[PDB]
Write a protein that binds this ligand. Structure first.
Ligand SMILES: [Ca+2]
Ligand SMILES: [Ca+2]
Length: 106
């Protein structure tokens, strides 16, 4: 946990410390992931894909904050729901590497 921690993304985590305060656009504006290399954006995807399915499922989405900081809170079910819906364009209920790359963007 906190394997992808840096000042910015730590600050994004801190900004949604309270339950139901998170929105992925605001997070990523603070956590400059989009600004990274396409390789470095995929690496974050595989970090989050904790079961190695090749896809990020809602259960891993839940744990998104912990990837950027240790002891972070899990996303609430409603948060996880809203973030999945935003990222899952093909509607299989999962986020693929292409859907990831889209989602990260400003
Ligand atoms: Ca997965
Ligand atoms: Ca999908």
């Amino acid at each position: 946990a906190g394997i992808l921690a840096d000042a910015d993304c730590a600050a994004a985590v801190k900004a949604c410390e309270a339950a139901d305060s998170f929105s992925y656009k605001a997070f990523f504006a603070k956590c400059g992931l989009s600004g990274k290399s396409a390789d470095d954006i995929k690496k974050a995807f595989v970090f989050i894909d904790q079961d190695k399915s090749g896809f990020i499922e809602e259960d891993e989405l839940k744990l998104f904050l912990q990837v950027f900081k240790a002891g972070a809170r899990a996303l609430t079910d409603a948060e996880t729901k809203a973030f999945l819906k935003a990222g899952d364009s093909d509607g299989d209920g999962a986020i693929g590497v292409e859907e990831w790359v889209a989602l990260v963007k400003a």
